[PDB]
From a paper:
The melting temperature (Tm) of Apo (unbound) BmMetRS was 60.6°C. A significant temperature shift (ΔTm) of 7.8°C was observed for compound 1312. Compound 1312 IC50 value for BmMetRS determined using the aminoacylation assay was 6 nM compared to 272 nM for 1433 and 1657 nM for 1415. In the presence of inhibitors, BmMetRS crystallized in P1 with nearly identical unit cell dimensions despite differing crystallization conditions. Binding of each inhibitor causes similar conformational changes to the residues surrounding the methionine-binding site (benzyl pocket Fig 5). Tyr14, which in the SeMet-bound structure forms one face of the binding pocket, swings ~50° to open up the binding pocket deeper into the Rossman fold domain. To accommodate each substituted phenyl groups of the inhibitors, Trp230 rotates out and away to create the necessary space.
Within the twenty aaRSs, methionyl-tRNA synthetase (MetRS) is especially interesting for it not only links tRNA with methionine for elongation in protein synthesis, but also links the initiator tRNA with methionine for protein synthesis. BmMetRS is characterized by the structural motifs typically found in MetRSs from other organisms: a Rossman fold catalytic domain (red), inserted connective peptide (CP) domain (blue), a stem-contact fold (SCF) domain (magenta), and an anti-codon binding α-helix bundle (green).
Numbering used by the authors: 3 to 297, 309 to 509
The structure:
């Protein structure tokens, strides 16, 4: 009955969808699905971040309006979510009116808390470095020109701007990191954030005057909101903010923001400060994943390797939170061994033995031997290990525990030699076949959030009713003898 709210970072649709976008959607989709099967009421959100000057100039470059350009490009990110079999319950675009109103509400709420003032962004700026510097990092040379520490000229620049009093929240954020050690993860991000905040926080510019493609500042519409309040507010726009009576508002606070490593500071410093200012509770965890390197277009990978092969490799091979690598032979070999061979072929060998030798019915199992109990108890244990792993977003440890059972089951099945038992002891052959099919059922229920369509097909050839596929069914709904099984077909074909 318990509510669970999980989000992805909204993607910037200035170019095409890339692997990093698909990686974050897949990882967050698997976490969302995991909690649904674990019995939770899940709301899972993703979307697009469409405002800004770079978007306005690209619309200018193509001869169309910014809103028109946003509609065109987000359509490909909306297509990517569908191709990846994402279970997101909503899709937020910052160009939508509900976000416009949500952003203006949270802005006013921060004005009402005393945290927003109008000022100036004046300082030394190097066009060559694209960076700002304090006066002390500079020196005027024999040129008569002033130079920054990198050896390039700096110029004095001055812009009008609204600010958020970020300096007022330095101590409250450190209190947050002390009272909730799991607020920013993994541990390396946590230490980055703590060291940054502990060194002193300056007030934060949150408005621009150089473009109208954005959300107008209430009461000064020559100014528009910068990315900070715009993008981050998407998390509460999707719940109906500012209408706190919306049925969806009970989902706040978010249980988990899944983000990339590069935007850690925006979600772990700016976002909680905005919320504290606006009198709102804080999300329970922000988790940052790493970056993927080809050691490439997401649509192409899916067509070449298959969706569930790609989902598996990305979540099994990179410890979630770290940088990782992908390559053709690695995807092929890792998916051939685990999916096509270990999982897929174990099902085919065992279940076609049931079709030919047990008349297409789940055999009636006799007494369980010591080996029978070990593989069954290991399968039950993998659920508990997977649960504890997913609580920490350790997706690879969850898949590792599940596929350690698959590998042990192959050794169990080969060690029982049920083909030899067909003549010596048909009743024993049945029990071994029952054990193997029963382990496949528990594994099949458990891999549903990581490879949903493939897991669905596996549970389909085990004749598992659609209402017996929650995680609670691992322990409570074992296969019943005498049940009719459809003719088995391979679930994981080998790569060509
Ligand atoms: O200049 C802008 C650029 C922009 N998108 C750039 C890519 C966003 N970076 C990823 C990101 C994602 C999230 Cl969820 C939150 C933040 Cl703060 C940042 N978004 C903008 C929105 C309003 C006004 C200006 C901009």
């Amino acid at each position: 009955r318990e509510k669970y709210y999980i989000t992805t970072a909204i993607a910037y649709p200035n170019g095409k969808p890339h692997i990093g976008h698909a990686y974050e959607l897949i990882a967050t989709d698997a976490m969302a699905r995991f909690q649904r099967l674990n019995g939770m009421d899940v709301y899972f959100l993703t979307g697009t971040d469409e405002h800004g000057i770079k978007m306005l100039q690209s619309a200018r470059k193509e001869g169309i309006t910014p809103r028109d350009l946003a509609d065109r490009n987000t359509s490909a990110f909306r297509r990517m979510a569908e191709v990846l079999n994402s279970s997101n319950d909503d899709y937020i675009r910052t160009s939508e009116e509900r976000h416009y109103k949500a952003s203006q509400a949270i802005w006013q709420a921060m004005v009402a808390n005393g945290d927003i003032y109008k000022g100036g962004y004046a300082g030394w700026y190097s066009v060559r470095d694209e960076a700002y510097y304090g006066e002390e990092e500079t020196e005027v040379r024999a040129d008569g020109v002033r130079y920054g520490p990198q050896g390039t000229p700096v110029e004095w620049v001055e812009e009008e701007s609204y600010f958020f009093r970020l300096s007022a929240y330095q101590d409250k954020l450190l209190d947050l990191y002390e009272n909730n050690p799991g607020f920013i993860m993994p541990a390396e991000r946590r230490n980055e954030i703590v060291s940054f905040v502990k060194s002193g926080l300056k007030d934060l510019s949150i408005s621009r005057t150089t473009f109208d493609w954005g959300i107008p500042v209430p009461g000064d519409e020559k100014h528009v909101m910068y990315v900070w309040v715009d993008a981050l507010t998407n998390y509460i726009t999707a719940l109906g903010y500012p209408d706190t009576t919306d049925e969806r508002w009970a989902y706040w606070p978010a249980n988990a923001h899944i983000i990339g490593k590069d935007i850690s500071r925006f979600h772990a410093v700016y976002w909680p400060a905005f919320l504290m200012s606006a009198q709102l509770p804080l999300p329970k965890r922000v988790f940052a994943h790493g970056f993927l390197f080809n050691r490439i277009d997401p649509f192409e990978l899916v067509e070449r390797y298959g969706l569930d092969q790609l989902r598996y490799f990305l979540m099994r091979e990179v410890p979630f939170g770290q940088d990782g690598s992908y390559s053709h032979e690695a995807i092929v070999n890792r998916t051939n061994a685990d999916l096509a061979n270990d999982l897929g072929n174990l099902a085919q060998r065992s279940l076609s033995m049931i079709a030919k030798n047990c008349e297409g019915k789940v055999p009636q199992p006799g007494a369980f031997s010591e080996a029978d109990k070990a593989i069954l108890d290991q399968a039950d244990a993998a659920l508990e290990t997977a649960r504890k792993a997913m609580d920490d977003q350790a997706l690879h440890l969850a898949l590792g525990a599940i596929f350690a059972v698959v590998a042990e089951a192959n050794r169990y099945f080969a060690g029982q030699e049920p083909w030899a038992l067909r003549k010596t002891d048909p009743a024993r052959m049945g029990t071994v076949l029952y054990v193997t099919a029963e382990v496949l059922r528990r594994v099949g229920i458990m891999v549903q959030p990581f490879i949903p369509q493939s897991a669905e097909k596996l549970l389909d050839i085990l004749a598992v009713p659609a209402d017996k596929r929650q995680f609670a069914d691992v322990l409570a709904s074992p296969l019943a003898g005498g049940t009719d099984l459809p003719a088995p077909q391979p679930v994981f074909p080998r790569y060509v």
